[PDB]
TrEMBL record:
The keyword Lipoprotein applies. The chain holds residues 26 to 185 of 227 of the full protein. Keywords: Lipoprotein, Membrane, Transmembrane, Transmembrane helix. Residues 13-164 form the LppM domain. This is DUF3153 domain-containing protein.
Amino acid sequence: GRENLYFQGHMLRVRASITISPDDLVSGEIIAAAKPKNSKDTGPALDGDVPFSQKVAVSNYDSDGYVGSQAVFSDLTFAELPQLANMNSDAAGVNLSLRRNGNIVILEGRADLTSVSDPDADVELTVAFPAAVTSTNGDRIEPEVVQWKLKPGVVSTMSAQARYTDPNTRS
């Protein structure tokens, strides 16, 4: 009992790719993958016992020689996103905040991973929406799909604004 059990990642991949529908319905997948290093690990696990765990399948990720965990969620709603983000944050160390501005949604996020111990860390966010982006601060591939490359050592802010029909239809 009690061995030197602390492992840095070193070339870890975090890819969050989520797709949100204007129906206030959100779905997607968050992959946090790290290199094994020790045989006890089949995939460093996400800690996310959320109230909607039935709507998010967190499972072990084993691909590319990376082992980690992935959270694959579907049929979630706008309110569930912050709570979802909690689990994500356990392996991310970043902050995400979504808010509605009338009937358009603003997504605010900041990733400060300056203090990361690994230069080969790659944190990547991809948001796909079958709507249309009004304003974003990141790299839009499509007018409805935006991606952010969060790099270690540096700080990056991520913002995405798009129009999505509010369930209450407020403003």
